[PDB]
């Protein structure tokens, strides 16, 4: 789907949390941090499936 | 005339009032906008024209901007240190 294989192998799952200018942080979905790009990947509580 | 046990209570009141004016300006908001926490310009689009902005203005008013982070009316105390121990009948 994106970037390159070397960078893709490197990325590990992280939970995104956006912060405004004001100060309250909004929580977002899961993502796959490939390189420094963010991938809209979904993590299932059961097992370890990362879709 | 006021004793130092008086000045302790007056300082307790003064620090609670200053914590309160730090809180009520730190976390107050109209539509998620902290009005007194930080200094910036709010521009109002008051006209159909592009430059019709009336800008409201702010000053950080916390305890450091007002300059009330240090307020001691507590005078001074003299502390004496006396050693504490447990005796022994070992002679």
Largest sheet entry of chain A: 2 strands, antiparallel
CA-atom Rg of chain A in angstroms:
13 Å
Number of strands of chain A: 2
Task: Report the helical percentage of chain A.
Answer: 10-25%
User: Could you spell the SSE succession of chain A in H and E letters?
Assistant: HEE
Q: How much of the polypeptide of chain A forms β-strand, as a percent range?
A: 25-35%
Assembly type: part of a larger assembly
Q: How would the global form of chain A be characterised?
A: flat
| Chains forming the largest contact | A-B, 4 and 5 residues
Instruction: Please tally the helical runs of chain A, counting DSSP H or I stretches of 4 or more residues.
Output: 1
Termini Cα gap of chain A: 13 Å
Give an overview in words:
The structure is cut from a larger assembly and holds two copies of chain A. Chain A contains one helix and two strands; from the N terminus they run H-E-E. With 51 residues, chain A is an alpha+beta fold. Chains A and B meet through loops of A and loops of B. Chain A: Belongs to the bacterial flagellin family. Chain A: It comes from Salmonella typhimurium. Chain A: This is Flagellin.
Summarize the structure.
Chain B: This is Flagellin. Chain A has 51 residues and is an alpha+beta fold.
Question: Descriptors for this entry?
Answer:
part of a larger assembly; 2 chains; 51 residues; alpha+beta; two-stranded antiparallel sheet; 1 helix; flat
How is the secondary structure organized here?
The structure is cut from a larger assembly and holds two copies of chain A.
Chain A: H1 5-10, E1 13-19, E2 25-32
Protein name (chain A): Flagellin
Subcellular location (chain A): Secreted; Bacterial flagellum
Function (chain A): Flagellin is the subunit protein which polymerizes to form the filaments of bacterial flagella.
């Amino acid at each position: 789907g994106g970037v390159d294989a070397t960078d893709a192998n490197g990325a590990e799952l992280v939970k995104m949390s956006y912060t405004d200018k004001n100060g309250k942080t909004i929580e977002g979905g899961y993502a796959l941090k490939a390189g420094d790009k963010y991938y809209a990947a979904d993590y299932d509580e059961a097992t370890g499936a990362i879709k | 005339t006021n004793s130092q046990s008086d000045l302790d209570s007056i300082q307790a009141e003064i620090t609670q009032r200053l914590n309160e004016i730090d809180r009520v300006s730190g976390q107050t908001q109209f539509n998620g906008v902290k009005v007194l926490a930080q200094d910036n310009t709010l521009t109002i689009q008051v006209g159909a024209n592009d430059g019709e902005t009336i800008d409201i203005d702010l000053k950080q008013i916390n305890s450091q901007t007002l300059g009330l982070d240090s307020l001691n009316v507590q005078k001074a105390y003299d502390v004496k240190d006396t050693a504490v121990t447990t005796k022994a009948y070992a002679n």
